[PDB]
Every structure is written in C-alpha cells, then in structure tokens.
Design a protein around this ligand. Structure first.
Ligand SMILES: [K+]
Ligand SMILES: [K+]
Ligand SMILES: [K+]
Ligand SMILES: [K+]
Ligand SMILES: [K+]
Ligand SMILES: [K+]
Ligand SMILES: [K+]
Ligand SMILES: [K+]
Ligand SMILES: [K+]
Ligand SMILES: [K+]
Ligand SMILES: [K+]
Ligand SMILES: [K+]
Ligand SMILES: [K+]
Ligand SMILES: [K+]
Ligand SMILES: [K+]
Ligand SMILES: [K+]
Ligand SMILES: [K+]
Ligand SMILES: [K+]
Ligand SMILES: [K+]
Ligand SMILES: [K+]
Ligand SMILES: [K+]
Ligand SMILES: [K+]
Ligand SMILES: [K+]
Ligand SMILES: [K+]
Ligand SMILES: [K+]
Ligand SMILES: [K+]
Ligand SMILES: [K+]
Ligand SMILES: [K+]
Ligand SMILES: [K+]
Ligand SMILES: [K+]
Ligand SMILES: [K+]
Ligand SMILES: [Mg+2]
Ligand SMILES: [Mg+2]
Ligand SMILES: [Mg+2]
Ligand SMILES: [Mg+2]
Ligand SMILES: [Mg+2]
Ligand SMILES: [Mg+2]
Ligand SMILES: [Mg+2]
Ligand SMILES: [Mg+2]
Ligand SMILES: [Mg+2]
Ligand SMILES: [Mg+2]
Ligand SMILES: [Mg+2]
Ligand SMILES: [Mg+2]
Ligand SMILES: [Mg+2]
Ligand SMILES: [Mg+2]
Ligand SMILES: [Mg+2]
Ligand SMILES: [Mg+2]
Ligand SMILES: [Mg+2]
Ligand SMILES: [Mg+2]
Ligand SMILES: [Zn+2]
Lengths: 140, 128, 101, 142
RNA sequence: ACAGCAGCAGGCGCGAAAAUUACCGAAGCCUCCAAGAGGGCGGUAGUGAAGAGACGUGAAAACAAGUGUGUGUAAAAACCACAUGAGUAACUGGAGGUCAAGGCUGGUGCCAGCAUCCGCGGUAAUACCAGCUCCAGGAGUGUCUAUGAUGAUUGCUGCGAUUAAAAGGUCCGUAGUCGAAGAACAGUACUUGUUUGUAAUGUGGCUUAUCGAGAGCCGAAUAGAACGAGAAGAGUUCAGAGUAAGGAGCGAAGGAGGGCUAGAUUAUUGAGCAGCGAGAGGUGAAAUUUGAUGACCUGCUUAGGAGUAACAGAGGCGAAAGCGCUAGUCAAGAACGAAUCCGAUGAUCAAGGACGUAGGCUGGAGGAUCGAAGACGAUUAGAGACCGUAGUAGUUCCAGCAGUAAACGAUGCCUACGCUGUUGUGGUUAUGAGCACGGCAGAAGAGAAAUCUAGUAGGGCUUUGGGGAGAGUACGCGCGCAA
RNA sequence: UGAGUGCAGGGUUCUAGAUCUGAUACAAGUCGUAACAAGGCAGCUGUAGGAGAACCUGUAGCUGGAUCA
C-alpha cells in the first residue's frame, strides 16, 4: 500500500481502522441521544416523585441521599444525587428541580455512589448552595 | 527483487559499521552511478571502479572517514521548491552540513543548488 | 514462558512421529519424546554361578543373556527416579547413561 | 524462487565473455547450416539441435559460426512449427497425467500435480496470444 | 363575508437556552408624473457580566465616580473644555499529594459529610462542620456540556503482531497494487517562466483619533485556468545482448513422496483334538468374576481381521495435513553437473476454485484387538469418578458429505546485506573446496526482561490488534442430511 | 395539467404483551471443592457421549511439564 499510485487503497484501509476506537465508534454507531444530560442538553428540568437512600461501595460505610425525578423532556424516571450537608431537607415531594452531570467522559458513576449519574443543582428556581447555607429562602 | 538504490545504501552502511574501507556492490543502474558520482564530488567516497561483466553490472568503491550515514527514499515524491526545506529539516542532522539529493531536468543536484537554479524535482536520497 | 529451546523433544524438520506405550502405565507417548532405557541381564543370577560350575554336564558353559529396550512417559520416569529435577544451568548438560543389568 | 514449489536451486551454465570463430572445428559454415536443417526436418526440438551440435560436431552455443539464432534460421527456411515448442511440451505432460488418472482414479497426488500443470499452460498461452503467435480462440487439446 | 408576522416592534407555547408594542425633514442607498413627496431598507439610542481594549479603589504632603455652563446631534443623551463641591470605592475559589499556600483552636465520632483521581472519618481528623491566619487570579472568579489539543492511544511524516491485544490450516487464482542490464526515442502528466485568478477576513507595512484595541491608505498572495521551456526520473521501442529473474529440455544419480498388482516372519483372540488333575485372573491391598460340562500350562491342527518391534537418530521425504515388511508396475516433481533453447513470459493477492489428523454423518463390505454409552464389584460422609470385571457405537475397507485443533518452531510470502568454530544428508571436485537442505556452540548488536525465526533498512504485496467485561454473543444473510 | 380522497400492499422507525431465557451487581445464604504445589487422577486445545453442580469418560494433538540427558 506504500506505492506512489496507491492512494485509493490506502485511504479505504485507514478509514476502516478507526472503528476500533471506542470514541469514534459510539459517535458513529451507538445511541448518543438516550440521556437526560449529554449530547442533547447541559441541564434538565424534572419533578420530584420519591425520596431515596443508597449504600456506598466498599470499603466506605455510608448512606447517600438520592431523589427520584420524572424528566419533562423524555418522560423517563431517573435517580439523582443531592450534594450538600443537610440538602435533603430543602426538597419536598412534587418540587421542581434542575439536574446536572457528574463530569466524566461518558455518563459514568463517580466516587463511591453505585449507579447514579446526575446531581441536583436548583430547587424551585433557586441555588441549592444558598438554600443549605441559609443565604436565601424558599419562594413560598 | 529489491530496489537497486536501496541495496546500494545498505551495502555501504553495514560495511562502514564493520569498519571496512572498501566494498563490492552487485547490481547497478544508471541513477546508482550518478548517486556515487555525487558522493565523490563532496568527498564522502574516494575511488570508484566499474566492472562491465555483461550481467547487470558491479562497482568497487573506497570509503572515507567522513561518511556517517546515507539512505534512499521510496517512493520518490514530487516537490516544489517551497517543499524541499521541510524534507531537509526532517532528514539532515544540522543546518550547517550534509546533503539532500534531488533529481531534476538538470541532473542530480543538492538542496543548495535548488535555490541557485530555482527548481524543484523528485526526492532521491541523502548523506551526512 | 518457554522453558526449553527444543520443546522437550527431539523432533526437527518433521510434521508427525510414531507413538509408543509406557512400560509402567501403558500411556501413549511420542517416540521422539519418550525416556529410553537399555538392559542386558544374565538369565542366571551371580549368586548361582558357583553351583552352575558343578551342575552343568558340559566342559565349559557360557550363561545366556537377555536384552531389552524399555520406554517411559515423563511422569513414570520422574516417579521411578530415572531422571530428577535440575537447576537452570544444569538443564543444558547432555550425557549418555549406563546400560542396566 | 521456483513458481509452483519452494525450490531455490542454482544450477545453470555460464555464457562466454566473447564468442570468436571456432577455428579448431572440422567443417565449413555451409556444412553446419546443412546439418541443422536436416536435423530439423527429421522432427527434433531446437534444444536437442543445440545438444548434438556441441556434442558430435564440436560447436559451442551454435551461433559463433552462423551470426543467427536457431529458431530464426528455421523461420528463414520455413520449417516453423504450428505451436511454440514450450507450450507444446506443457500440453504433453497434461495429457500424460490425465491418462494416468483415467485408470488410477484414487491418486490425490496426481490430482494435485494436474491443477498446477494446467495453471502453467494458461499463463504461457496468454503470453503467446499477445505477441500474435497463436490464434485468439486457441484452446487446449483436452 | 374576510384572512396567512420564516418584514419591524409585540404576545403565547416549547425548552437548559435569546432585547423596546422606543426616536428619525440627519448620514448610506432605492422609488416616482417631482427645485418636492415616500421608505420599520437603513441609521439613533434603550436592554443583557456570551466576546475584545484602556483605567479607579490612595499618596507622602494632598486621590475616580458628583454638579453647572458650553459643546456635541435630526433632536438628543454619553464623550471632550472650563468652573464649582468633596473624600466614597472587592469579591470568587482554595490551603493531604498532583498543585501555590496551616499537623493552629473548638465540635463530630465509618455517623454526618468530603472527594475529577488517589483517598479521608470507628473520641489524639493539617482532608467533614465552623472561627482565625495564609495562597491564587482579580471586576471578576467557580461549575456543567460539546470540540481541538494532551496522543507516536489511529501512526503519510510516525505505533505494533515469539511470550502483553494481534501472521489467515495449506495451495491455486481474477480484479487491484508493484516490476532487469545495454543502446536509443518522444513529450501528456513532472518541474519551472510569463500572464490571468482574492471584496471582506488573514498576511507584510505606514498614517491619524490622549493611549490601546479601532479607522484610513499601500504591497504581495492560495487553489484553478492560457501560452512557452527543460528533459534526470517515469514512459515507448530495438536486437552482432543474453540476471546468484522465470519457463522448456539433456546427463548421471538419491529419498518411510503418491496410486496399483502379487507375496511374507511373528503376535492377540476363537474353535477342534491330546496330555495333567486343582486352582487361575487382578491389585497398594482385595472383591466382582471364571474352573471336575476338566480351567491354567504344554503339544499338534486350523479360521479370521488389524499391524509392521528391535535396527531407528536433535536421520530422510512431502504444499501442509502426513509417510516405516518384500518384489514388480504407472505418472509427475525437487536438487546437482555443464559453452542446450525461448526472451520478460514475473512478485503478492479481495472474489472464485482444490486438499485438510482425529472425532462425526449417508450408503455398501466386514468384525481379531481396544473401547464412549450402559451394567456391576470395591473405596468413601457421599462417589455418580479415579481402580478391577465385563460390554455396545465406533476403531478397518470402498463411494461421498463435513471443514474444526496448543492445524505451534505460538514467529506471513518473495528479495537483500551481514562473525567464527564444529557436526550431519545428497551430488560434484584443480582434493584446496563449493552448491542445496539442516543441527549445535559462542560473539557482536538488539530487547522491559526471558532470550534471539527478534541484527541492519522509507524494498515490494496481502492478513491483522487498539484497557478489562458483556462477546466471538443477539438480529439478518450464505453454505450443510444433521451435528 | 392536476389538488384531494377511496382500496390493497410494501419500506422505515418507535411502543404494548401472558410467559420464557441471557447478562451484571449482589457484606459473608445452601451444597460440594473443579483450578493454582506431582493441588492429592499433571494441566490445556479440537471432537463425541454422559451428568445436582463445578465437571467426568473415550479418541487424536500440544508443553505454556514434573524430562533440553
Ligand atoms: K477503590
Ligand atoms: K502437528
Ligand atoms: K526428552
Ligand atoms: K528449473
Ligand atoms: K505464487
Ligand atoms: K503449490
Ligand atoms: K514458490
Ligand atoms: K406577512
Ligand atoms: K418578528
Ligand atoms: K443567554
Ligand atoms: K457612544
Ligand atoms: K474565603
Ligand atoms: K478548613
Ligand atoms: K481538630
Ligand atoms: K485505544
Ligand atoms: K506508518
Ligand atoms: K481459515
Ligand atoms: K538469462
Ligand atoms: K511405488
Ligand atoms: K476423517
Ligand atoms: K459408567
Ligand atoms: K456402591
Ligand atoms: K472404569
Ligand atoms: K476388555
Ligand atoms: K472435501
Ligand atoms: K470443501
Ligand atoms: K482457528
Ligand atoms: K525445508
Ligand atoms: K517484540
Ligand atoms: K446466530
Ligand atoms: K482435574
Ligand atoms: Mg432592519
Ligand atoms: Mg506545596
Ligand atoms: Mg483539601
Ligand atoms: Mg501501542
Ligand atoms: Mg496467555
Ligand atoms: Mg497472545
Ligand atoms: Mg494465529
Ligand atoms: Mg494609537
Ligand atoms: Mg527509466
Ligand atoms: Mg482341555
Ligand atoms: Mg521391521
Ligand atoms: Mg525440474
Ligand atoms: Mg471414522
Ligand atoms: Mg499469504
Ligand atoms: Mg478491548
Ligand atoms: Mg482439586
Ligand atoms: Mg487434578
Ligand atoms: Mg509454568
Ligand atoms: Zn507411564
């Protein structure tokens, strides 16, 4: 394939090789639009339906606080994590929450939380960081 | 069959590494003659004899102490005068010495003569 | 990792070889790999030759010998102690063993 | 290397540096030229013509005296065969193998040799029917 | 009956996502029968930390932002000039390592939380929650999401395939990519001149807004096309030329290479008959089991179906799978010797075609030995297994199907350049040596090492890998009687 | 020249479904112990039977073997 007039053979071969890369393959041949946050959108709105808790992976020993969210844009139901110290207390059933990604290349689990892929950002139009640290109050 | 200009290069490179002063090279073509004659002009090789054996051809050559390395490029890429310095920087060790040889309508010439004559050509080989 | 340069057998420049059967357990082993042992044993024991000298009718007598070639598989040769495990530099030494009696 | 098998033999014979004229010989030009054309009409292949000239009449390579090659002389005399002698010897070997297999059908080794032989025929045919030495629709005797 | 905002404002929805139902006889342009009329085209401001410049938040004597006039414009506001007051003006992320900066004080005790990654916390936490001091950037700083770089982890330049992931089981073969020396010839590619071909952007500059982005003027330019020129490489032809390129042929010889015909020395079983009169077999040790219907062992007769011991090897032959008794017969091949003939006929290979141990399947022949399945005897907690007794399909042959192996020297095929000693096999020999096919032991280089079919290298062509898993699995398709 | 609309079919993409059958994670549940030491019958590859389950048995192969002899 290294001959001077071999360009056609060379091009067709090298194109076919790239499908061995996971990155190129997923963009070409996988379902890249299945996710609430990803290629489609940076943030997602949804309504809280259940409060939930999950164990951390070994060797850690903890209960992590999680929320069941119905996503307006897809009608899927997903699990999200609630970040801050007393954070679970700032959320009621049937509140609206905005939800965000964990920051890995694909949608992947982070740290010791098994199988959860998003986190809460805002509750009832206001920043959760401000709610928890008592800098601002619920809209009421 | 091997390329004759490739065979020439490996034969002299190995013999130089083994610290021999002379070699016999077994299959010769028209551009092989012109390549060797170029290395003689720049004082990389000293003495050349050609044997007219009626079977292809063969040469006997004396090596100088100045030759570090030589090589052929395959395939022989076409180059504009704008392109030659890219190949010069890729192949040669220093901006101060060594030769990159190019075939042209004016015979074999080096990368300096290309500037003088204002001509590109096809890339052939190098030595330093 | 590769333990021996010859793969533990004497086959070179061939596809396939005849098999033989182990003396101790009847397992099949390739002829070029089997451990071989030669035996030349008198029919009459050394502890009887002094009686033979008064028992025989002939003026002189030569005792008949019996001849054998025996074959062993690796497991049997190691267990019967025809061969033993050896160090990484000893493995390379090749010398002919004695004929048994 | 060899074309149908893994051979790398090197047995050949050296061609001389210069050819001269064979003055040690005991015949004229015209006699040698007569000897060739007789051997030709009797039906000998041109490689055998060469062997006889060397062995019996004492002339090496059969050209130093004539300034002309054996097959060209046969075309000048009009004695040219219908098929080139190489292609002709390939058809013969094929026929032989098919005549063996016709009575000893079980021989897988002979079957193997036939498919090799047949391939070589077609490769030679395509050479000659490009140089206009055979009619375009020529086909094997099979 | 009427009606169609992917015109300008504006509203509702949808979403993670985007401004005023504002002024306009002025600037740039367009339209008419016009010393005039029209234009949401266009211009002017308002709104918003998408982007980009220049500067405030003090000095050691003495500091923005305000205000009033003038300007500015279509009218304005801002900008600039002079004149008045004065003394206002920092946050975001961090402080165990990567990675700049605290083993500080108090709470909490695998809780609550933190942490991109590695990891912290079970009562002595520089990592959680706070106080206090430090660090970094600073009118800005954190997070999420796509992409370029990191990355020689996509490799033209420039990676890998003995053992880490990775050379097709072996051949033939089309399309495709790649192809001697010598003597000559021609100009379409190739390279280059002149002329065309670029507003903005970008590039090399100079000049004016306090400065700096900004604005204004200059010069050269890509790919593409027109006409000339040069002939090294590539291309075409020739034969007083004949490759350590190929094919055809000659001579003497070598080999478990293959098909067929006709024979062979023993051995293992089975029957017949004769002799003898009590055990044989099997194991680590024993039991199933067989024997007075005479076993076992020793004779003589016979009947079958497999196989070729020892010699026999780091020996030979074959494309691989594979091939071992003796004669006769039938085709083709490899190597060697040499002054035979033809002359580029060649390398590698998608598609397509032929062979392929064993076990398996369809039909016929046959059936000694061995033995999946099945059945017993022992051993064990239990053995369905390992061991012993027995026993069927298969194991052999002819005519076919099938298509897999740790089909491995785990090392593709042609072709090169390469140190020494020793030992083989077959020819030839000036007896000094060579040519083809091997084994072995060092060296030098190489490599993560072990080691070396792995040294040197932009020679040609095909196959093939890209962190573990799921997975050589699902769906579709092609072959097969099925597997 | 033809908009619309009947009636059969196809081509695409989604979605329902009694029941069955894969995979993955299961702090540590039940039964054995198949592999790694000659792992207690040396291991592994192809093929064919059998079996609670790892697996066991015949046949040809390989050393990555417990032998460069
Ligand atoms: K971990
Ligand atoms: K084999
Ligand atoms: K051995
Ligand atoms: K030949
Ligand atoms: K070939
Ligand atoms: K072949
Ligand atoms: K070949
Ligand atoms: K409209
Ligand atoms: K609008
Ligand atoms: K916005
Ligand atoms: K302004
Ligand atoms: K702070
Ligand atoms: K702190
Ligand atoms: K503390
Ligand atoms: K990769
Ligand atoms: K490359
Ligand atoms: K295959
Ligand atoms: K020749
Ligand atoms: K024969
Ligand atoms: K078979
Ligand atoms: K059984
Ligand atoms: K039992
Ligand atoms: K058994
Ligand atoms: K039996
Ligand atoms: K077949
Ligand atoms: K087949
Ligand atoms: K395979
Ligand atoms: K060989
Ligand atoms: K390697
Ligand atoms: K399938
Ligand atoms: K086992
Ligand atoms: Mg407008
Ligand atoms: Mg530090
Ligand atoms: Mg920290
Ligand atoms: Mg790599
Ligand atoms: Mg492995
Ligand atoms: Mg591997
Ligand atoms: Mg492989
Ligand atoms: Mg300026
Ligand atoms: Mg040329
Ligand atoms: Mg009896
Ligand atoms: Mg024999
Ligand atoms: Mg031959
Ligand atoms: Mg069979
Ligand atoms: Mg190949
Ligand atoms: Mg992978
Ligand atoms: Mg075990
Ligand atoms: Mg075991
Ligand atoms: Mg091991
Ligand atoms: Zn044994």
């Amino acid at each position: 394939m290294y001959g001077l007039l071999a360009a056609r053979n060379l091009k067709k071969n090298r194109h076919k090789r790239r499908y061995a890369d996971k990155d190129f393959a997923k963009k070409a041949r996988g379902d890249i639009y299945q996710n609430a946050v990803g290629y489609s959108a940076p943030h997602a709105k949804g309504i809280v339906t259940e409060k939930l808790g999950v164990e951390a992976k070994q060797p850690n020993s903890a209960i992590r606080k999680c929320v069941r969210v119905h996503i307006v844009r897809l009608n899927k139901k997903v699990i999200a994590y609630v970040p801050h110290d007393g954070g679970l207390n700032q959320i009621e059933i049937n509140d609206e929450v905005i939800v965000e990604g964990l920051g890995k290349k694909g949608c992947r689990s982070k740290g010791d939380i098994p199988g959860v892929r998003f986190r809460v950002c805002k509750v009832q139009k206001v920043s959760l960081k401000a709610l928890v640290t008592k800098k601002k109050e619920r809209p009421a | 069959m091997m390329d004759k200009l490739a065979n020439l290069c490996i034969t002299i490179n190995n013999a130089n590494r083994a610290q021999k002063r002379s070699v016999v090279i077994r299959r010769i073509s028209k551009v092989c003659r012109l390549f060797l004659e170029s290395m003689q002009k720049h004082g990389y090789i000293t003495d050349i004899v050609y044997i007219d054996d009626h079977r292809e051809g063969k040469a006997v050559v004396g090596l100088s102490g100045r030759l570090n390395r030589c090589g052929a490029i395959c395939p022989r890429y076409d180059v504009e005068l704008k392109d030659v310095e890219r190949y010069r920087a890729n192949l040669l060790p220093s901006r101060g010495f060594g030769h990159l040889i190019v075939t042209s309508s004016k015979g074999l010439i080096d990368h300096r003569e290309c500037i003088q004559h204002n001509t590109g050509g096809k890339i052939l080989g190098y030595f330093y | 990792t590769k333990k021996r340069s010859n793969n533990g057998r004497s086959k070179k420049n061939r596809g396939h070889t005849r098999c033989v059967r182990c003396e101790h357990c009847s397992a099949m082993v390739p002829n070029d790999k089997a451990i071989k042992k030669f035996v030349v044993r008198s029919v009459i024991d050394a502890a009887s030759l002094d009686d033979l000298k008064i028992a025989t009718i002939y003026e002189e007598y030569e005792v008949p010998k019996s001849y054998y070639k025996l074959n062993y598989c690796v497991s049997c040769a190691v267990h019967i102690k025809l061969v033993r495990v050896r160090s990484r530099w000893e493995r390379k030494i090749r010398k002919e063993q004695r004929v048994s009696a | 290397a060899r074309m149908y098998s893994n051979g790398k033999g090197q047995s050949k014979s050296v061609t001389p540096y210069n050819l001269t004229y064979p003055t040690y010989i005991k015949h004229s030009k015209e006699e040698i030229v007569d000897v060739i054309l007789n051997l030709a009409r009797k039906g000998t292949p041109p490689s055998q013509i060469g062997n006889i000239l060397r062995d019996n009449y004492g002339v090496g390579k059969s050209f130093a005296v004539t300034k002309t090659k054996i097959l060209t002389l046969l075309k000048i005399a009009g004695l040219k065969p219908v098929i080139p002698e190489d292609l002709n010897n390939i058809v013969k070997k094929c026929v032989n193998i098919k005549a063996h297999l016709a009575k000893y059908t079980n021989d897988k080794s002979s079957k193997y040799q036939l498919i090799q032989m047949q391939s070589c025929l077609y490769r030679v045919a395509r050479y000659y029917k490009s140089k206009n030495e055979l009619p375009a629709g020529w086909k094997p005797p099979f």
